[PDB]
Design a protein around this nucleic acid. Structure first.
Ligand SMILES: Nc1ncnc2c1ncn2[C@@H]1O[C@H](COP(=O)(O)OP(=O)(O)OP(=O)(O)O)[C@@H](O)[C@H]1O
Ligand SMILES: [Mg+2]
Ligand SMILES: [Mg+2]
Length: 438
DNA sequence: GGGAAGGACTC
DNA sequence: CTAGGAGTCCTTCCC
């Protein structure tokens, strides 16, 4: 909940529930929770069959591993995570001044991509459907998303970022990591005028410290675009991101570059505030008595024998406050996809032609990157939100509508057939091309 | 070690 | 169109 707290979680939760109670969605949502409780159940079973000598041995490895990490802990880099405030809303408020005074969201009546802060006061958030949102805030204006407009402001701000780190990596249209470690060195020798900017006396000079260079960035960002950003400063990416939210909107937070600072932050940081730990992992760990990053580190024993090698390796990093100190600046796309949810469709005649408009639309997007690919996956979703997913890869490549529809046509047919005589009651369909030459 | 199927997570 | 769409990475399962 990254914005408004101190909310009437009673009148809000009641409304959300009344508008979800007997829904077809909530039904599936309930079966999911059952499925997640089962998963916990097998974990809790696996736990019950561990012997203290088994556990004790785990302690040896994990502590040795820890010790290795701890020795290669890097506190030399200053990483900044920039995170625009209520981004899609804000852009729209900028574009259309009228809206600047009221609660608004960007999305549809059936789903919100975000919502400006005034609306968050009513508990209106992203991922929440616009019709529930409107019940929370009957005067909410929902604005349709216009990605071209958002991409502009994105590259409008990416222009400020390159100054402080030509190598900065963007994560989305409103987020990027910067490693200002090198800028911070050169900046120590910068005279006033090189760090003095004219407002909207009318001028300010920014200091020489990381804290200031980030104030300066945020300032330039607000002045050039009209929008406000928040920022996190810390030794590595994982912390920098947690920090960029500690003071939203329009503020910033630093963890100073020393072990203890890190350690003091982490201590009581709820594990869910970390990027990559979701709703499920939270619940699974809460089940083992794990809520804060301290509790996560103290169970490093158990974790290495209940979870995939990659999950505990990862969990351990977080528990010790480690993260990336080096922005990969990688890239290259793994897949491209087009999918669409719609008022029910059970007629195979249209199911086939929807798959065509999709395959066809995909081809064009795929075309603009001049990309070609071997694998093709369709994705159908019942009227009950159950999702199927059927793949097929050929051995040539395939690129245009007709050829990509060629394969998707068939995959669709097999599932219509598989359920015959009963037709497939669909709310969603989608088509994903992947495995590109490389 | 190249598939296919289902999911967790995040924006 | 009255619970999105887009993408990546993982976990498991078979030649
Ligand atoms: N669940 C979502 N579905 C579709 N688009 C989203 C979703 N969440 C975010 N976005 C889009 O990406 C942008 C960045 O998301 P982010 O999580 O940074 O929230 P925000 O809108 O910037 O608000 P703030 O960062 O102040 O909390 C949003 O403005 C929009
Ligand atoms: Mg943001
Ligand atoms: Mg999280």
């Amino acid at each position: 909940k990254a914005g408004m707290e101190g909310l009437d979680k009673e009148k809000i939760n009641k409304i959300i529930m009344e508008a979800t109670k007997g829904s077809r969605f909530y039904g599936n949502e309930l079966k999911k929770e059952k499925q997640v409780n089962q998963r916990i159940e097998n974990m809790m079973q696996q736990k019950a069959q561990i012997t203290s000598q088994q556990l004790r041995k785990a302690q040896l490895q994990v502590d040795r591993f820890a010790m290795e990490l701890e020795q290669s802990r890097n506190l030399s880099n200053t990483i900044v995570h920039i995170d625009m405030d209520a981004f899609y809303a804000a852009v729209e408020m900028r574009d259309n001044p009228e809206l600047k005074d009221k609660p608004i969201a960007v999305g549809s009546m059936s789903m919100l991509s975000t919502s400006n802060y005034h609306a968050r006061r009513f508990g209106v958030r992203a991922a929440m459907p616009g019709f529930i949102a409107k019940r929370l805030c009957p005067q909410l204006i929902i604005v349709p998303p216009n990605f071209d407009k958002y991409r502009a402001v994105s590259k409008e701000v990416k222009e400020i970022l390159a100054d402080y780190d030509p190598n900065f990596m963007a994560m989305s249209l409103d987020e990027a990591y910067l490693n200002i470690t090198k800028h911070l060195e050169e900046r120590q020798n910068w005279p006033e005028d090189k760090r003095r900017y004219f407002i909207k006396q009318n001028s300010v000079v920014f200091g020489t410290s990381a804290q200031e260079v980030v104030k300066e960035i945020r300032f330039r960002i607000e002045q050039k675009t009209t929008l406000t950003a928040s920022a996190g400063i810390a030794p590595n990416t994982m912390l920098a991101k947690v920090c960029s939210d500690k003071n939203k909107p329009n503020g910033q937070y630093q963890i100073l570059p020393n072990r203890q600072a890190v350690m003091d932050f982490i201590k009581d940081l709820p594990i869910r505030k970390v990027s990559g730990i979701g709703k499920v992992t939270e619940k699974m760990l809460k089940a083992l008595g794990i809520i804060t990053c301290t509790e996560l580190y103290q169970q490093r024993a158990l974790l290495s024998l209940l979870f995939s090698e990659t999950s505990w390796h990862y969990f351990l990093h977080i528990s010790l406050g480690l993260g990336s100190t080096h922005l990969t600046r990688d890239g290259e796309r793994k897949s491209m996809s087009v999918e669409r949810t719609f008022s029910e469709i059970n007629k195979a005649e249209e199911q086939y032609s929807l798959c065509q408009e999709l395959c066809s639309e995909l081809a064009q997007d795929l075309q603009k990157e001049r990309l070609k690919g071997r694998t093709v996956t369709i994705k159908l979703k019942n009227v009950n939100f159950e999702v199927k997913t059927r793949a097929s890869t050929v051995s040539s490549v395939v690129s245009t509508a007709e050829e990509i529809f060629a394969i998707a046509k068939e995959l669709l047919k097999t599932e219509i057939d598989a359920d015959f005589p009963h037709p497939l009651r669909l709310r969603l369909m989608g088509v994903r091309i992947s495995s590109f030459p490389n």
